[PDB]
């Protein structure tokens, strides 16, 4: 079919999660009612995307986006680090491009782990 | 109405009708198809005589208009719903760079 | 004149608008421009009678619902 | 292609006998496909008969788009048109 | 996974008439016939093979499927086959077109011979946005009229005479008509060459002297290819499509029609079935074409070659060369004689219960007919308030209500089912007499189920039908949808057509014995009483 | 996960006129944009919202109501793709396959762009890294490099009988990647 | 079905598919669309191109016309009406398409033209100079010399620049050449008619007298404009070197280039006549007489033939008078020929007595090479060597014996060189197929039948020449369309093969398609050398 | 295929015109690289 704007309004993963959460409250629940060919992906996206928060943020999301606004970087990698949560490793370096430096090690460790562990 | 008095005969139906199939409903056939294929008539279907051949609805009488059904929806429901989507990417993209 | 007399389903293509058989164009062998529609059967015999000789009554299509 | 607004409509405000039969047949073809009616009908059959009861009450949710020969849409709702 | 499949309701907006070129015939073709004439009758069931009707084309029987599309005679659209013939032959239908397009060309440079300023003026005159079909033929007549004035050519020194038909299907070019006393250098070459060839043989070729120029169809096939193609716009053809090209009006490939078009007549079930003559004509084309292609290089040619080639030209001319009657055949109709009945209303025709049992009406079940259609199915086809067929919502089949399928079938009755109910009281029906003069010959009525088998109707409505009853038959049609049934009772029925449109006078009103029954009541010598007036008031209502 | 805005026309039958317009159009758009992979856009999931609807037009043939809409269906498509989580499916000495389970299992990653110090054995053991090697059902965070669409290969009708007497194969949405980072490829290689 | 023998483009497009394939491989694809409507229609304005392409706008049509005008692929013509409204009109230019057609033979003949300074300058400098001339179109000197940094050898271009425009190719830019051939005559034909006042009738017109002499006079002056002109040549500054003025821009002339290419076929006919040394002295005597020769047909009879018998008669007679009276090309003396004694004079007498019409009409003793009596022999000597080469020598016998007399008859061919009824008829029908028999009938009945009729065979000229010319253009259109077939099979190979400035299956793919890409050009040059003769009168 | 009637004389690989094809393809590459491309 004729598309109009392909790459428009890059949204995060938690926004998709809360959209499919609020999509299954218009009708009967997916988990509370467990105890037409559309509920499959509806219960499979919400099950697969919640695998990293195992052993939730509206105002904490606001504080986190202001903290990401405190220092500047590239465009979509802020979305990548606000979704992947790189906390207990050096995976932030794995996000932003080569040359492992931009700023020194005792600052990348704390600006990684406080931000990605408070959320 | 064309500026000349020409009646209804073999040479009379060619006054305005561009329709080849309407002019194929008359005697002395097998000569109006070949010059229509030679001079390459575009032949936009508008007359009722070539809408009953193709099975189309005619544009006179009952099919001279269209009826459509109103949705009766307001602009309050057709809103671009939005709550904290592009706020993260707008501030940390033009700061000190 | 059409439904109770000679209702006959067919497929005609958009580019070089001749007709094929239900999945294929027979002229453009890729055959993705196939549009299925109904037509009187005597019009189908008239089209094949014209196409048997050196006349090509090409069908130019447009959608009903535009704006 | 331009749509004439309500304050610039130039056609007749009456209902033609050609547009009385088509709106009734379209309503009766919709009712035969199990559409909800909006009239207190007595128990009967033949959607062409119970569409006349809606036309006499003027509760048909359609409009009659009247095309002029350049594109002059001119909406003309059914309840605006009198019998 | 799968993909989005989108569809749009389309309709026809034009008919661009054109001629098939050499590539378009071969592209839509299935196979070439390739020198087969005996239809390949081997002694198994006398089947058919290549070079004729075959499974590469369509089918003409119950068995022996197509195997291009696996279907019977009811489900095969037919397929074409190309037929290439050596020595490309002249087209019989484009004779006048070839003469008119050869009058507008030089025969040496193969270009147009109109002056390039008058070409510019007439070309600007062609592209006016308002041009009628009667106007453009006049402009092309002016093209061919001014083009018969330039005797020489604007690019070469050759002279153009006149070109016409040799009074056959032979195009002659009478040269040297405009040449008078002023002898051309080409005229000097003409005189020297003919004097030389008469000096060789002064016995035979002296009597025949007016034999100037001929146009071989093999030669003008090679002369239509040397066009500049900016000149294929004043000749009528619009050369913006690759299906333009005046070369494409000469036979180089003959499209063989499908065998679904070629009739296999049903004067059979007898052994050794016979076909029509069109396949015989195709066979007789293929045989002489292969004979020319074989004997082109194998011996005695020239007289047999030109005789068989002109015979092939006459064969192709006979192949496509050799009424305003009724035509269309309509389902759900009847024809019965008529009878008098003034107890019936003017908007009704009484239909007997013997033809109101096979003339059905398709009714979709909904919320407002489930209480009736169940009993209608239970009554069955023999009891008159009943039904015959039943179409499921998921389209299982068209199951008839005759072989099994009792009481339990009416019990389920899913909401998308379509029954075919018998004709009942109050159904819209249209009613016709076959010599239809004006628009009051086809009215619309309501039905009424009665005894003995005639189409009786009231006599206040027999005046537009021109009924003089005496055993005259009339036709009866029932509409089969919800939208055409409304367009008969609203603007076509009896109560909405009390007038004639010829003068506005009432054409459909009181009749013969209803006039003399009103002259005797309203006569002045009649005086009634309550033992009589009450009976008169009770017999009218 | 992008927000693609496309526009088409849909039909609503007369037996669904009792509901409101928004839920009817939303139900008719979900039968078309289920697990119904779009040509060169990716795979749609749901419908976010709809806007600038028009008057419901109708032809004399059907009797249903045709509405041309403009909506913002959510399509699972990374713009280039850098790092995404998905566990392994089955061991093969080729471009190894993973599963982003719940949506589709079609992502390959070619082995030739990974570390050149590995070897696959036919004794059911997987690729051995220059410590222990990986096994089944473990979360793998990998790279996205190449994503090339092939939409529709139509099939000729006389060819459709040589594939039905004896007995889809190209995926319409396939991804590739190239693992390069030291330690990336398994979760418990870190910590 | 399996259409593989090139049938879906076989007959649908001659005479414009060549022009669409010469511009598709050079100027993108959007230029092919606007050049396929100038040929298929003719004259159409800017808005007509927009409403006829169906897919480009005014911002797209007007942009592509500049890229065609820069390669002089579009003629300009402005017009007006009786009420005004002056607008712009565009014609298709075949000279620019011929420049795009040859394109390497321009930079092949110009290499083998200069003297003793050989293989130290004419591989790097002039091979970039002329290639930038042909590619970029109209070039000036100052905008081009600024590309090189620290031009220490800035005078080395000027020595090759003043020499090359002195004797040929480089010429002043198209201030005349964008105008059409027809309107340059028609505007000159009407200005010498309305500026004559009223007078006596004298056979009712009389002005067609004056308007058929004097306009031709200054038409020749217009023909005198693209030649060797001293307005740009031999400018003498004080205390410096002889230099031309580098101010105005300059392009190439496709009029002296073609008459130098005609000398190749003349050398081939000389090698057909005589072997080694006498052909070499005819070669050098023709190369010394190149830049002043009469050319391939002038625009006086390219268009505007007004049906006059005397004009068509004494146009080839006054061309003989142009041939007789040159400012020095008739001076073809012995020491002038040997400068760049009696032995080569004897070889030149052998040229005089060779009796096929080259190097004739020597009444006082000074020799001259005729051209107008040479062109039919040039066009026919190559036509007789193609049927003899491809179709057969018996076909050449059966075709040339038609030409021995005028209209040999059927009972006279079988009396010459071969018996009857065996292969004379098959060969004769095959030559009917290639437009070289032109059958004619005389009847013995009342409706001109085939049984009671006998035939007459005369080889009519300018029907065998035009058909073979169209066939050669067709096969040229073939040979460049198959070159675009390997581009779709190398779109993912030639695009990636640019970052280097082993996978040995690519060695049988990349270096295997290269000779298949070069042999089509090696055959296209021979297509060019065989086709040129039918467009040089 | 279908054409089997004989072939002309301009088809050996004994050419010695290899420089002309190189000049052809370098002219084509310099025209394709130029500013007046306007492709697709
Ligand atoms: Mg009677
Ligand atoms: Zn097609
Ligand atoms: Zn079939
Ligand atoms: Zn001519």
From Swiss-Prot, chain A:
Miscellaneous section: Present with 2930 molecules/cell in log phase SD medium.
Membership in a protein family: Belongs to the eukaryotic RPC9 RNA polymerase subunit family.
GO cellular component, as recorded: cytosol; nucleoplasm; nucleus; RNA polymerase III complex
Native source species: Saccharomyces cerevisiae (strain ATCC 204508 / S288c)
InterPro entries, alphabetized: HRDC-like_sf (IPR010997), Rpb4/RPC9 (IPR005574), Rpb4/RPC9_sf (IPR038324), RPC9 (IPR038846)
First and last residue of the signal peptide: none
BP term (GO), one: transcription by RNA polymerase III
Keywords, comma-separated and alphabetical: DNA-directed RNA polymerase, Nucleus, Phosphoprotein, Transcription
Subcellular location: Nucleus
Function comment: DNA-dependent RNA polymerase catalyzes the transcription of DNA into RNA using the four ribonucleoside triphosphates as substrates. Specific peripheric component of RNA polymerase III which synthesizes small RNAs, such as 5S rRNA and tRNAs. The RPC25/RPC8-RPC17/RPC9 subcomplex may bind Pol III transcripts emerging from the adjacent exit pore during elongation.
SUPFAM superfamilies xref list: HRDC-like
TM ranges: none
Name under which the protein is recorded: DNA-directed RNA polymerase III subunit RPC9
Curated annotation (Swiss-Prot), chain B:
Source superkingdom: Eukaryota
Subcellular location: Nucleus
Additional facts recorded: Present with 6020 molecules/cell in log phase SD medium.
Similarity comment: family membership: Belongs to the RNA polymerase beta' chain family.
Main function: DNA-dependent RNA polymerase catalyzes the transcription of DNA into RNA using the four ribonucleoside triphosphates as substrates. Largest and catalytic core component of RNA polymerase III which synthesizes small RNAs, such as 5S rRNA and tRNAs. Forms the polymerase active center together with the second largest subunit. A single-stranded DNA template strand of the promoter is positioned within the central active site cleft of Pol III.
Subunit structure: Component of the RNA polymerase III (Pol III) complex consisting of 17 subunits.
Name of this protein: DNA-directed RNA polymerase III subunit RPC1
Native species: Saccharomyces cerevisiae (strain ATCC 204508 / S288c)
Organismal lineage: Eukaryota, Fungi, Dikarya, Ascomycota, Saccharomycotina
UniProtKB/Swiss-Prot annotation, chain F:
Keywords: DNA-directed RNA polymerase, Nucleus, Phosphoprotein, Transcription
Signal peptide: none
Subcellular locations according to the entry: Nucleus
Annotated family: Belongs to the eukaryotic RPB7/RPC8 RNA polymerase subunit family.
NCBIfam families referenced in this protein's UniProt entry, alphabetically: rpoE
PANTHER family: DNA-DIRECTED RNA POLYMERASE II, III, DNA-DIRECTED RNA POLYMERASE III SUBUNIT RPC8
UniProt miscellaneous comment: Present with 752 molecules/cell in log phase SD medium.
This protein's name: DNA-directed RNA polymerase III subunit RPC8
Source species: Saccharomyces cerevisiae (strain ATCC 204508 / S288c) (Baker's yeast)
Swiss-Prot record, chain G:
Sequence segments annotated as region (Leucine-zipper): 472-493
Pfam families: HTH_9, POLR3C_WHD, RNA_pol_Rpc82, RPC3_helical
Keyword presence, Transcription: yes
Entry keyword annotation includes Phosphoprotein: yes
Compartment(s): Cytoplasm; Nucleus
GO cellular component: a single term: nucleoplasm
GO molecular function: single-stranded DNA binding
Stored InterPro entries: POLR3C_WHD, RNA_pol_III_RPC82-rel_HTH, RNA_pol_III_Rpc82_C, RPC3, WH-like_DNA-bd_sf
Keywords on record: Cytoplasm, DNA-directed RNA polymerase, Nucleus, Phosphoprotein, Transcription, Zinc
Family matches, as PANTHER family: DNA-DIRECTED RNA POLYMERASE III SUBUNIT RPC3 (PTHR12949:SF0), RNA POLYMERASE III DNA DIRECTED -RELATED (PTHR12949)
Family, similarity comment: Belongs to the eukaryotic RPC3/POLR3C RNA polymerase subunit family.
Stated role: DNA-dependent RNA polymerase catalyzes the transcription of DNA into RNA using the four ribonucleoside triphosphates as substrates. Specific core component of RNA polymerase III which synthesizes small RNAs, such as 5S rRNA and tRNAs.
Record's protein name: DNA-directed RNA polymerase III subunit RPC3
Source lineage: Eukaryota, Fungi, Dikarya, Ascomycota, Saccharomycotina
């Amino acid at each position: 079919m004729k598309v109009l704007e392909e790459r428009n309004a890059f949204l995060s993963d938690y926004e998709v999660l809360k959209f499919l959460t609020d999509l299954e409250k218009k009708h009967l629940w997916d988990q509370k009612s467990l105890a037409p060919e559309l509920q499959g992906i509806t219960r499979n996206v919400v099950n697969y995307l919640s695998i990293n928060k195992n052993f939730m943020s509206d105002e904490s999301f606001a504080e986190l986006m202001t903290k990401l606004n405190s220092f500047k970087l590239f465009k979509a990698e802020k979305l990548q680090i606000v979704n992947q949560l790189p906390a207990n490793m050096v995976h932030l370096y794995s996000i932003v491009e080569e040359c492992d430096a931009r700023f020194d090690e005792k600052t990348i460790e704390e600006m990684l782990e406080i931000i990605s562990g408070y959320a | 109405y064309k500026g000349e008095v020409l009646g209804i005969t073999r040479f009379g139906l060619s006054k305005m009708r561009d329709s080849v199939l309407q002019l194929a409903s008359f005697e002395k056939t097998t000569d109006h198809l070949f010059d229509a294929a030679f001079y390459m008539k575009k032949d936009a279907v508008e007359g009722v005589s070539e809408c009953i051949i193709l099975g189309q609805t005619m544009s006179i009488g009952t099919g001279s208009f269209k009826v459509v059904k109103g949705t009766n929806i307001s602009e309050k429901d057709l809103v671009p719903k939005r709550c904290l989507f592009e706020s993260l990417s707008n501030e940390a993209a033009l700061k000190a760079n | 004149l059409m439904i109770s007399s000679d209702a006959f389903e067919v497929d005609v293509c958009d580019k070089c608008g001749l007709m094929g058989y239900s999945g294929w164009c027979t002229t453009c062998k890729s055959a993705e421009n196939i549009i299925k529609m109904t037509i009187p059967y005597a019009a189908k015999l008239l089209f094949q009678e014209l196409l048997s000789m050196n006349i090509a009554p090409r069908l130019r299509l447009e959608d009903i619902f535009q704006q | 292609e331009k749509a004439i607004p309500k304050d610039q409509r130039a056609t007749t405000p009456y209902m033609t006998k050609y547009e009385r039969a088509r709106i009734l047949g379209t309503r009766a073809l919709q009712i035969s496909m199990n559409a909800p009616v909006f009239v207190d009908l007595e128990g009967e059959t033949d959607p062409l008969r119970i569409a006349m009861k809606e036309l006499a009450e003027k509760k048909i949710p359609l409009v009659i788009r009247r095309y002029l020969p350049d594109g002059s849409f001119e909406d003309w709702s059914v309840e605006e048109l009198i019998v | 996974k799968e993909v989005v499949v989108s569809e749009t309701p389309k309709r026809i907006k034009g008919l661009e008439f054109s001629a098939l070129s050499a590539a378009d015939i071969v592209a839509q073709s299935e196979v070439e016939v390739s020198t087969r004439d005996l239809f390949d009758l081997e002694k198994d069931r006398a089947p058919k093979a290549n070079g004729a009707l075959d499974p590469k084309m369509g089918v003409s029987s119950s068995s022996l499927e197509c195997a291009t599309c696996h279907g019977n005679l009811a489900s095969c659209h037919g397929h074409f086959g190309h037929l290439k013939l050596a020595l490309p032959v002249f087209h019989i239908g484009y004779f006048k077109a070839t003469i008119q397009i050869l009058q507008g060309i030089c025969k040496n440079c193969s270009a147009i011979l109109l002056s390039e300023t008058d070409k510019r003026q007439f070309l600007h005159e062609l592209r006016r946005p308002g041009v009628d079909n009667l106007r453009r033929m006049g402009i092309l007549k002016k093209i061919l009229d001014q083009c018969k004035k330039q005797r020489r050519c604007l690019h070469c020194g050759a002279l153009n005479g006149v070109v016409k038909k040799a009074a056959a299907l032979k195009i002659i070019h009478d040269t040297f008509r405009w040449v008078g006393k002023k002898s051309a250098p080409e005229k000097d070459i003409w005189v020297g060459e003919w004097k030389e060839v008469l000096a060789h043989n002064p016995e035979l070729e002296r009597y025949v002297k007016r034999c100037m120029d001929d146009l071989n169809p093999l030669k003008t096939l090679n002369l239509f290819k040397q066009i500049k193609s900016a000149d294929c716009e004043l000749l009528g053809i619009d050369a913006t499509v690759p299906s333009g090209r005046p070369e494409t009006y000469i036979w180089r490939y003959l499209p063989a029609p499908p065998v679904c078009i070629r009739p296999s007549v049903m004067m059979q079930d007898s052994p050794a079935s016979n076909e029509d003559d069109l396949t015989v004509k195709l066979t007789e084309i293929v045989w002489t074409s292969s004979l020319i292609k074989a004997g082109l290089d194998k011996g005695i040619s020239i007289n047999n070659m030109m005789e068989h080639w002109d015979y092939l030209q006459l064969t192709v001319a006979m192949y496509i060369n050799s009424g305003n009657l009724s035509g269309k055949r309509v389902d759900f109709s009847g024809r019965t004689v008529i009878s008098p009945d003034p107890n019936l209303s003017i908007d009704e025709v009484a239909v007997p219960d013997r033809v109101a049992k096979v003339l059905t009406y398709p009714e979709k079940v909904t919320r407002y007919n489930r209480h009736k259609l169940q009993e209608l199915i239970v009554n069955g086809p023999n009891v008159h308030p009943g039904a015959n067929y039943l179409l499921k919502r998921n389209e299982d089949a068209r199951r008839n209500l005759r072989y099994g399928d009792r009481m339990k079938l009416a019990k389920n009755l899913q909401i998308g089912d379509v029954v075919e109910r018998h004709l009942e009281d109050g159904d819209v029906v249209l009613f016709n007499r076959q010599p239809s003069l004006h628009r009051l010959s086809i009215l619309s009525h309501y039905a009424k189920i009665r005894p003995w088998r005639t189409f009786r109707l009231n006599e206040c409505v027999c005046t537009p039908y021109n009924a003089d009853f005496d055993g005259d038959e009339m036709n009866l049609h029932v509409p089969q949808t919800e939208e055409a049934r409304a367009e008969a009772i609203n603007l076509m029925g009896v109560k909405n057509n009390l007038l004639t449109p010829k003068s506005g006078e009432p054409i459909i009103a009181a009749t013969q014995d209803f006039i003399t029954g009103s002259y005797l009541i309203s006569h002045k010598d009649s005086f009634y009483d309550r033992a009589t007036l009450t009976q008169l008031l009770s017999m009218m209502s | 996960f992008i927000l693609s805005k496309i526009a088409d026309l849909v039909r609503i039958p007369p037996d669904q006129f009792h509901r409101d317009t928004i839920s009817a159009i939303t139900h008719q758009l979900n039968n078309k944009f289920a697990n119904k992979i779009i040509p060169n856009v990716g795979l749609c999931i749901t419908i976010y919202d709809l806007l600038t609807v028009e008057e419901g037009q109708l032809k004399p043939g059907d009797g249903s109501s045709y509405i041309n809409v403009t909506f913002r269906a959510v399509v699972f498509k990374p713009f280039l793709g850098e790092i995404v989580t998905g566990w392994i499916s089955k061991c093969t000495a080729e471009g190894i396959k993973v599963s982003l389970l719940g949506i589709f299992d079609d992502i390959f990653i070619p082995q030739n762009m990974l570390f050149e110090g590995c070897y696959y054995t036919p004794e059911e053991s997987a690729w051995i890294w220059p410590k222990l090697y990986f096994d089944v059902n473990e979360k793998i965070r990998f790279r996205i490099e190449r994503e090339v669409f092939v939409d529709v290969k139509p099939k000729s009708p006389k060819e459709r009988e040589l594939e039905e007497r004896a007995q889809e194969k190209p995926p319409a949405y396939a991804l590739l990647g190239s693992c390069q980072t030291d330690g990336m490829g398994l979760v418990s290689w870190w910590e | 079905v399996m259409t593989i023998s090139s049938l879906e483009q076989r007959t649908l497009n001659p005479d414009l598919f060549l022009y669409k394939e010469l511009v598709k491989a050079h100027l993108g694809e959007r230029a092919a669309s606007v050049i396929g409507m100038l040929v298929a229609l003719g004259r159409l304005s800017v808005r007509e191109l927009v409403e006829k392409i169906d897919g480009m706008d005014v911002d797209s049509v007007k942009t592509t016309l500049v890229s065609l005008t820069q390669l002089r692929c579009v003629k300009y013509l402005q017009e007006t009406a009786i009420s005004g409204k002056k607008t712009t009109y565009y014609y298709y230019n075949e000279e620019g398409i011929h420049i795009l057609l040859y394109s390497g033979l321009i930079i092949d003949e110009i290499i083998t033209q200069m003297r003793v300074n050989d293989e130290e300058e004419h591989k790097q400098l002039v091979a970039e100079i002329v290639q930038n001339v042909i590619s970029l179109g109209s070039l000036t000197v100052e905008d081009y010399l600024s590309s090189v940094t620290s031009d220490s050898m800035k005078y080395t271009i000027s020595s090759l620049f003043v020499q090359l425009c002195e004797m040929g190719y480089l010429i002043q830019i198209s201030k005349l050449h964008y105008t059409p051939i027809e309107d340059l005559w028609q505007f000159l034909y009407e200005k010498h008619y309305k500026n004559i006042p009223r007078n006596s009738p004298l056979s009712d017109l009389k002005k067609r007298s004056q308007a058929k002499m004097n306009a031709k006079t200054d038409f020749a002056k217009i023909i005198n404009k693209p030649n060797e002109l001293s307005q740009i040549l031999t400018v003498d500054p004080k205390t410096s070197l002889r230099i031309v003025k580098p101010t105005v821009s300059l392009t190439i002339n496709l009029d002296r280039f073609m008459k130098g290419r005609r000398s190749k076929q003349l050398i081939n006919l000389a090698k057909t006549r005589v072997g080694s040394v006498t052909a070499q002295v005819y070669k050098i005597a023709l190369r010394l007489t190149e830049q002043k020769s009469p050319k391939i047909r002038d625009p006086l009879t390219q268009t505007g033939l007004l049906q006059d018998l005397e004009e068509a008669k004494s146009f080839q007679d006054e061309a003989e008078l142009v041939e007789e009276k040159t400012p020095g090309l008739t001076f073809n003396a012995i020491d002038l020929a040997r400068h760049l004694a009696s032995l080569i004079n004897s070889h030149l007498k052998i040229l005089a007595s060779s009796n096929f019409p080259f190097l004739n009409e020597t009444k006082p003793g000074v020799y001259y090479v005729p051209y107008s009596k040479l062109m039919p022999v040039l066009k026919s000597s190559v036509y007789e060597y193609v049927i003899a080469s491809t179709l057969g020598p018996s076909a050449m016998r059966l075709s040339r014996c038609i030409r021995d007399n005028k209209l040999v008859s059927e009972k006279i061919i079988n009396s010459t060189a071969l018996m009857k009824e065996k292969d004379i008829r098959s060969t004769l029908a095959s030559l009917i197929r290639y437009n070289s028999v032109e059958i004619q009938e005389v009847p013995r009945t009342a409706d001109r039948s085939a049984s009671r009729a006998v035939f007459l065979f005369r080889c009519k000229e300018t029907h065998s020449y035009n058909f073979m010319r169209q066939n050669l253009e067709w096969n040229m259109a073939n040979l460049l369309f198959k070159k675009e077939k390997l581009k779709q099979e190398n779109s993912t190979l030639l695009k990636k093969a640019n970052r280097d400035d082993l996978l040995p299956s690519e060695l049988n793919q990349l270096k295997m398609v290269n000779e298949r890409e070069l042999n089509v050009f090696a055959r296209l040059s021979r297509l060019l050398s065989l086709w040129e003769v039918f467009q040089m009168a | 295929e279908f054409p089997s009637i004989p072939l002309p004389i301009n088809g050996p690989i004994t050419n010695k015109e290899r420089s002309l094809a190189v000049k052809y393809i370098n002219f084509g590459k310099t025209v394709k690289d130029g500013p007046f491309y306007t492709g697709s």
